């Protein structure tokens, strides 16, 4: 009735703060893993050059 | 050059990109009053981080699809000089192919 | 699970058929265990067979050592099949509970009968053989899962709190592993990220130094009877035997890829015996396979290479994390619009409360300035 | 404003307690008496110093109510008793 | 042909975006709950039992 409730009450703030920090850490890790991917595709100039070779020009 | 068609992947969900964009807009619209701007060098907020991540993913998907809206891509995707360089290359290629069409049609 | 009259009737009806089935299972499991024990004694390492002594560095109390007193029989498939091992494990659980009940009966003579009535009214401690139909088996499994839910969070909190209050991780990767190990089951934990916590806790506490209270919590979470607990080296022996059998079966399955060919119900039972898949979650084959593969990955390549599993304490914490459901929250958000201290409104504010409101209210700056100016004037007059 | 109590403090000054970092600090430099944010927290100096928070009428931009799906967790168990019911 | 190539990757990205949205929604819900709790706290009408619940 008295002791355990008082100690739980004393615990509450630190746990709340630590859990808030943990959530912010999760969000930060989520953000840090985002990178914009740039893909390289075969230049069409080579395709045009090959077309010329097929044209036998 | 590409290789071969990659193995089929099944959407574990089902929603159009338009539906996703509308959902994102609704989610970010309710927090506009709470959302507060700050200096670039200052730490960001939860709303700002969520908006940046969502818009980055959305605009990356759009650019991959073909909706080359550079005005928003330069805002929600540019975070590195490499991004700016590859965007410039993409912006010249896109706008050059367009011009060449008019010359080749006329 | 709380006792009920319906469960009491169910168990009373199936009491003697259950005992007969238990006796038949006892014969079969004795045969299986005889085979396994002979194989261990013949091909087991010298330390394992001789029961090498490992003493704690503080009070020199002997306890089973994971490296020496636990051995994985890579070639057990020749003599014993996976199904036989699972049968042996289930019978070990049932025999433990039945042995405790029989010991109580022998100790207290005919005075245990009302306690037997209490026992039969709950499916928590009755053998699986007492269920003669699918619905009864489902209810029994639900009771076992309820007990696991009741017990596991305490064990997890004990471990986490003791470590976090008496030590900290060395490097960032260990920090991430420790933080992600104790996440709620609603999220999926990557075994690769979490594995280093095993080495960290080996640095902190091995299975040979496990405390008696933590052991009691673990036994509660594993549906192992704990009364009378006695010395920590009895339930510790039970846990060691169960996990040794589980590791042998896991090695067999991994080597032979039996889980892929394993049917849905058998796969679910296999996961359940590993404390990975509660029945109340109604998991499908995809989720069961994902969790089983995660468990195998957590075991790591070294398990197949040498038969050395990670720290048993951290392994138990990881597996039991699936029973750590998110803390319940029921009620609409509108309930936050009410007031909790309306009954005090009639009392009003006394003089001290009025003073505090005046000093720390919106006019606080004005009052502070006035008070400081008055005090400065009085001090100047005094000088 | 009402005369109701607030988060209990135990007569501790949060600017010097062993867990002071868990209490947010306001602009005035006075740490809060509760995990929440308090603008008008103060410190009083009796034989021992103690932190005090005076409730006041303040408006905060209220985010719209979310859906019940995203904050309700129906994991209640027969043994579970809520803090309100316990009270 | 390119669409056939850039189809599975696009599907995975879309699913990841949906999952990210579903992951962010609970955070906003918690933030709203904390805002309401703070509002009641500043009025002196918040009990510890309610906060823990
Ligand atoms: C009539 C006199 C009565 C006297 C008073 C008694 C008072 C009650 C005390 C308890 C007595 C026993 C009760 C029955 C238990 C069931 C049998 C048994 O041992 O089950 C195995 C099982 C062993 O547990 P474990 O942890 O797996 O063992 C680890 C070992 O490594 C296991 O080794 P392993 O890993 O190599 O595996 C081996 C396993 C492999 O086998 C298998 O896997 C197959 C299955 C075998 C076991 C089957 C058990 C079935 C139990 C249920 C039976 C049916 C119940 C039906 C109920 C309803 C009926 C209507 O086989 C075994 O389990 C063999 C264990 C060794 C034998 C133990 C028995 C010794 C006593 C009997 C001989 C007496 C000789 C007297 C000579 C007199 C000369 C003058 O027993 C238990 O669960 C332990 C008992 C739990 C209760 C403990 C309560 C406190 C006891 C304190 C006693 C202190 C000394 C006495 C004084 C007390 C003063 C206060
Ligand atoms: C036919 C059948 C088949 C054959 C037989 C087969 C074998 C059967 C036997 C084996 C069965 C084993 C399994 C049993 C499972 C069930 C155990 C159990 O009881 O569960 C709780 C069970 C309910 O279980 P449940 O609802 O299923 O919940 C289970 C949960 O999982 C909750 O689980 P939990 O874990 O939370 O519960 C555990 C709880 C279990 O405990 C309890 O739950 C407490 C139960 C009693 C509560 C009583 C509350 C009400 C009090 C009323 C007071 C009187 C009111 C006024 C009456 C006015 C009448 C006119 O705590 C403990 O385990 C503590 C253990 C304590 C051990 C103590 C050891 C002492 C050793 C001493 C020191 C020695 C040191 C060494 C010295 C050496 C020296 C040389 O409790 C009850 O049913 C309560 C019954 C209350 C009866 C009425 C009040 C007493 C009436 C007395 C009448 C006296 C008449 C004569 C008077 C003469 C005067 C001259
Ligand atoms: C506001 C006021 C309210 C009212 C208050 C009333 C006044 C209370 C004031 C005093 C209270 C504190 C007293 C403390 C004393 C010191 C205790 C101590 O030092 O313990 C150390 C230590 C602590 O135990 P532990 O093993 O570490 O774990 C204890 C936890 O509670 C284990 O917890 P867990 O969670 O790990 O396990 C949970 C679960 C786990 O589930 C299981 O374990 C499976 C089921 C197991 C069933 C039992 C298996 C037993 C196997 C054999 C044990 C050895 C027998 C030795 C030979 C027999 C000796 C009698 O176990 C259970 O549910 C246990 C069920 C037990 C039910 C019985 C509890 C007593 C209720 C009253 C009935 C008797 C009334 C007599 C007086 C009235 C007569 C008219 O005790 C032991 O080592 C246990 C030794 C037990 C020996 C047998 C009992 C000897 C005492 C005399 C019995 C007389 C019987 C008379 C029959 C009727 C004649 C007419
Ligand atoms: C209603 C019934 C009433 C019953 C009353 C009787 C008492 C209760 C009965 C039993 C109750 C159940 C629970 C008992 C405790 C269980 C402990 C436990 O879990 O052990 C697990 C453990 C199993 O674990 P494990 O891994 O296999 O092996 C343990 C490891 O070695 C562990 O490795 P470690 O690293 O820990 O190694 C250390 C370990 C090493 O020890 C062991 O573990 C080995 C086993 C014990 C060996 C004990 C004998 C040592 C040599 C004695 C030499 C005496 C020579 C005297 C010559 C005199 C010539 C004139 O421990 C020690 O070093 C301790 C040594 C003993 C020191 C004794 C000091 C006594 C001081 C006396 C002060 C003065 C007294 C008053 C004045 C008297 C004189 C005027 O069990 C055992 O090893 C043996 C358990 C034996 C249980 C007791 C059996 C009771 C039989 C009762 C029969 C009589 C009944 C009378 C009834 C009367 C009417 C009612
Ligand atoms: C309603 C009330 C009615 C009246 C009630 C009357 C009450 C009388 C008050 C006086 C009683 C004092 C004794 C209290 C015992 C409980 C202590 C306890 O729970 O402490 C927790 C204590 C705290 O542990 P923890 O803090 O969790 O962890 C610390 C360590 O990590 C733990 O790590 P660990 O487990 O590895 O280390 C411990 C373990 C490590 O050691 C081992 O593993 C090796 C085991 C070696 C065993 C050696 C046995 C030697 C026996 C030789 C017999 C030779 C044959 C003789 C035959 C002819 C003569 C009969 O060593 C032991 O604990 C065993 C020590 C030797 C036990 C001897 C048998 C019990 C004697 C009880 C009577 C004592 C005198 C009483 C009168 C004076 C009182 C001032 O845990 C233990 O000690 C666990 C084991 C407990 C065993 C004793 C209890 C067994 C159950 C009793 C059954 C009989 C019931 C009779 C009922 C009578 C009703 C009237
Ligand atoms: C802690 C509390 C204390 C009080 C209590 O609860 C627990 O203690 C509990 C202990 C209970 C007794 C335990 C055991 C029996 C025997 C049974 O007997 C079956 C029928 C036959 C045997 O089958 C009876 O035939 C006999 O056969 C024997 C040869 O086999 C002959 O010799 C014997 O003459 C002859 O009658 C009849 C019921 C009874 C008396 C129980 C009554 C209720 C209690 C007093 C409880 C009670 C509520
Ligand atoms: C009341 C008491 C109740 C007791 C209950 C439990 C009883 C258990 C009995 C088990 C009997 C096993 O049977 C026993 O097995 C061992 C191990 O294979 C055999 O052991 C044999 O092979 C081993 C291994 O190569 C050799 O180290 C040993 O020298 C040799 O004898 C025994 O020759 C055999 O007799």
E50: contact with C, CB 8 A cutoff? yes
Which of B5, B31, B61 is closest, CB to CB, to E5?
A: B5
Nearest atom of ligand 1 to the alpha carbon of C92: 43
Q: CA-CA-CA-CA torsion for E45, E46, E49, E52, nearest 10 degrees? A: 160
Tokens of C330: 């029921």
The interaxial angle of helices B46-65 and A3-32, nearest 10 deg, is 30
User: CA–CA separation, B22 vs B16, rounded Å?
Assistant: 10
Exposed, middle or buried, B47 (CB in 10 Å: 0-12/13-18/19+)? Answer: buried
Structure-solving method: cryo-EM
Transcribe C240-253 into DSSP letters: HHHHHHHHHHHHHH
SS3 string, D13-59, reads CCCCCCCHHHCCECCCCCECCCCCCCCCEEEEECCCEEEEECCCCCC
Half-sphere exposure of C99 (CA within 13 A, CB side): 12
Transcribe C19-48 into DSSP letters: HHHHHHHHHHHHHHHHHHHHHHHHHS-HHH
Transcribe E8-24 into DSSP letters: HHHHHHHHHHHHHHHHH
Chain D residue closest in CA terms to E50: D84
With a CB cutoff of 8 Å and minimum separation 6, the contacts of D64 are B30, E32
C114 CA to centre of ligand 2 in angstroms: 9
C233 CA to centre of ligand 4 in angstroms: 14
Angstrom distances, CA of residue A13 to CA of C279, D23, E51 = 36, 7, 11
Q: How far is CA C251 from the centre of its chain?
A: 22
Q: C42 CB less than 6 Å from ligand 7?
A: yes
With a CB cutoff of 8 Å and minimum separation 6, the contacts of C184 are C321, C324, C325, C326
C230 CA to centre of ligand 7 in angstroms: 28
The distance of B8 to chain E (nearest Cα, Å) reads: 6
User: Do B69 and B55 contact (CB within 8 A), yes or no?
Assistant: no
Ligand 6 pocket test, pick from C110, C115, C116 with the greatest ligand atom count within 8 Å of Cβ, gives: C110
Nearest to B27 by CA among E26, C278, C329: E26
Q: CA-CA-CA-CA torsion for C120, C125, C129, C135, nearest 10 degrees? A: 80
Contacts with A30 from chain E: Cβ below 8 Å: 20, 23
Half-sphere exposure of C141 (CA within 13 A, CB side): 18
C113 CA to centre of ligand 6 in angstroms: 9
Query: What letter would DSSP give residue D70?
Result: G
User: CA–CA separation, C342 vs D4, rounded Å?
Assistant: 8
The tokens 């192992």 sit on which residue? C224
| A36–B49 C-beta distance less than 8 A | no
The tokens 């955070």 sit on which residue? E27
D63's torsion region: left (phi>0), alpha (psi -120 to 50) or beta? beta
User: CA–CA separation, C54 vs C63, rounded Å?
Assistant: 6
User: CA–CA separation, B18 vs C250, rounded Å?
Assistant: 47
Q: CA-CA-CA-CA torsion for D60, D63, D69, D71, nearest 10 degrees? A: -30
User: Do B87 and B70 contact (CB within 8 A), yes or no?
Assistant: yes
E20: contact with A, CB 8 A cutoff? yes
CB neighbours of residue B64 within 10 Å: 14
User: Do A53 and A47 contact (CB within 8 A), yes or no?
Assistant: no
User: Do E11 and C307 contact (CB within 8 A), yes or no?
Assistant: no
The distance of B31 to chain D (nearest Cα, Å) reads: 6
User: CA–CA separation, C101 vs C94, rounded Å?
Assistant: 11
User: Do E51 and D9 contact (CB within 8 A), yes or no?
Assistant: no
User: CA–CA separation, C182 vs C160, rounded Å?
Assistant: 8
Q: How far is CA E36 from the centre of its chain?
A: 16
User: CA–CA separation, C272 vs C222, rounded Å?
Assistant: 11
Whether the bond between C145 and the residue before it is cis, its omega within 30 degrees of 0, is no
User: CA–CA separation, C83 vs C77, rounded Å?
Assistant: 11
Looking at all shown ligands, the one closest to residue C53's CA atom is 4
Longest dimension (CA), chain E: 65
User: CA–CA separation, C123 vs C2, rounded Å?
Assistant: 9
Nearest to D37 by CA among E34, B49, B45, C335: E34
A27: contact with E, CB 8 A cutoff? yes
- Phi, psi values for residue C110, rounded to 5°: -85, 5
Q: CA A21, A24, A25: angle at the middle one, nearest 5?
A: 85
Q: CA A19, A24, A25: angle at the middle one, nearest 5?
A: 95
Q: How far is CA B8 from the centre of its chain?
A: 24
* Helix (H), strand (E) at residue C79: none
Nearest to C194 by CA among C205, C183, C206, C178: C178
Q: Which long-range contacts (CB under 8 A, 24 or more apart) does B25-29 make?
A: B27/B54, B27/E21, B27/E24, B27/E25, B27/E28, B28/B54
Resolution expressed in Å: 3.5
User: CA–CA separation, B93 vs B74, rounded Å?
Assistant: 16
- Phi, psi values for residue D53, rounded to 5°: -120, 125
């Amino acid at each position: 009735d008295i002791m355990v409730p008082s100690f739980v009450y004393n615990k509450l703030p630190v746990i709340h703060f630590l859990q808030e920090k943990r959530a912010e850490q999760k969000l930060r890790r989520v953000l840090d893993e985002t990178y914009t991917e740039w893909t390289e595709e075969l230049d069409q100039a080579h395709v045009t050059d090959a077309i010329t070779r097929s044209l036998n020009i | 050059y590409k290789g071969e068609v990659p193995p089929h992947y099944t959407r574990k969900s089902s929603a159009t990109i338009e539906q996703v964009e509308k959902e994102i807009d609704a989610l970010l619209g309710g927090a506009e009053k709470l959302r507060k701007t700050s200096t670039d060098d200052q730490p960001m907020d939860k709303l700002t981080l969520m908006e940046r991540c969502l818009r980055h993913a959305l605009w990356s998907y759009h650019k991959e699809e073909g909706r080359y809206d550079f005005d928003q891509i330069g805002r929600w995707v540019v975070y590195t000089p490499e991004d700016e360089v590859k965007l410039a290359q993409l912006k010249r290629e896109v706008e050059a192919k367009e011009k060449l069409a008019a010359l080749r049609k006329r | 699970m709380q006792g009920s009259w319906s469960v009491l009737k169910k168990n009373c009806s199936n009491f003697f058929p259950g005992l007969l089935a238990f006796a038949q299972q006892t014969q079969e499991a004795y045969g299986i265990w005889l085979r396994i024990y002979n194989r261990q004694q013949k091909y087991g390492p010298t330390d394992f067979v001789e029961q090498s002594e490992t003493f704690s560095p503080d009070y020199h109390k002997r306890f089973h050592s994971q490296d020496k007193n636990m051995w994985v029989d890579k070639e057990l498939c020749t003599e014993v099949s996976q199904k036989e091992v699972a049968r042996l494990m289930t019978y070990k659980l049932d025999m433990w509970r039945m042995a405790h009940c029989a010991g109580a009966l022998l100790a207290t003579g005919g005075y245990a009968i009302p306690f037997g009535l209490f026992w039969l009214a709950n499916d928590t401690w009755v053998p699986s053989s007492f269920n003669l139909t699918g619905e009864e088996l489902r209810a029994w499994r639900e009771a076992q899962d309820l007990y696991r839910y009741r017990s596991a969070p305490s064990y997890l909190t004990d471990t986490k709190w003791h470590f976090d209050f008496h030590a900290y991780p060395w490097n960032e990767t260990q920090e991430r592993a420790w933080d992600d190990l104790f996440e709620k089951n609603d999220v999926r934990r990557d075994p690769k990220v979490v594995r280093p916590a095993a080495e960290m806790y080996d640095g902190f506490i091995k299975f040979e130094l496990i405390r008696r209270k933590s052991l009691r919590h673990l036994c509660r979470s594993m549906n192992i009877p704990t009364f009378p607990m006695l010395a920590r080296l009895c339930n510790g022996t039970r846990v060691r035997d169960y996990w040794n059998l589980a590791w042998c079966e896991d090695y067999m399955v991994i080597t032979q890829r039996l889980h892929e060919s394993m049917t849905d119900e058998e796969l679910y039972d296999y996961a359940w015996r590993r404390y990975l898949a509660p029945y109340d979650k109604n998991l499908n084959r995809e989720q069961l396979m994902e969790r089983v593969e995660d468990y195998f990955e957590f075991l790591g390549p070294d398990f197949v290479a040498h038969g050395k599993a990670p720290n048993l304490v951290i392994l138990t914490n990881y597996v039991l994390g699936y029973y750590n459901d998110p803390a319940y929250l029921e009620g609409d958000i509108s309930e936050l619009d009410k007031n909790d201290y309306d009954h005090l409104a009639s009392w009003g504010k006394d003089a001290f409360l009025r003073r505090l409101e005046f000093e720390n209210g919106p006019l606080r700056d004005q009052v502070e300035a006035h008070t400081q100016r008055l005090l400065a004037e009085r001090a100047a007059i005094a000088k | 404003v009402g005369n109701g109590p607030t988060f209990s403090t135990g007569g501790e000054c949060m600017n010097t307690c062993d867990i002071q970092n868990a209490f947010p600090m306001n602009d005035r430099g006075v740490r809060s008496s509760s995990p929440f944010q308090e603008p008008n927290t103060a410190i009083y100096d009796s034989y021992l110093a103690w932190t005090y928070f005076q409730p006041m009428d303040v408006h905060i931009e209220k985010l719209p109510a979310p859906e019940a799906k995203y904050y309700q967790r129906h994991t209640k168990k027969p043994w579970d008793v809520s803090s309100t019911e316990l009270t | 042909t390119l669409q056939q190539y850039r189809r599975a990757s696009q599907d995975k990205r879309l699913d990841d975006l949906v999952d990210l949205l579903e992951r962010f929604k609970p955070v906003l819900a918690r933030e709203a709950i904390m805002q309401r709790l703070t509002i009641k706290h500043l009025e002196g009408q918040l009990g510890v039992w309610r906060y823990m619940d």
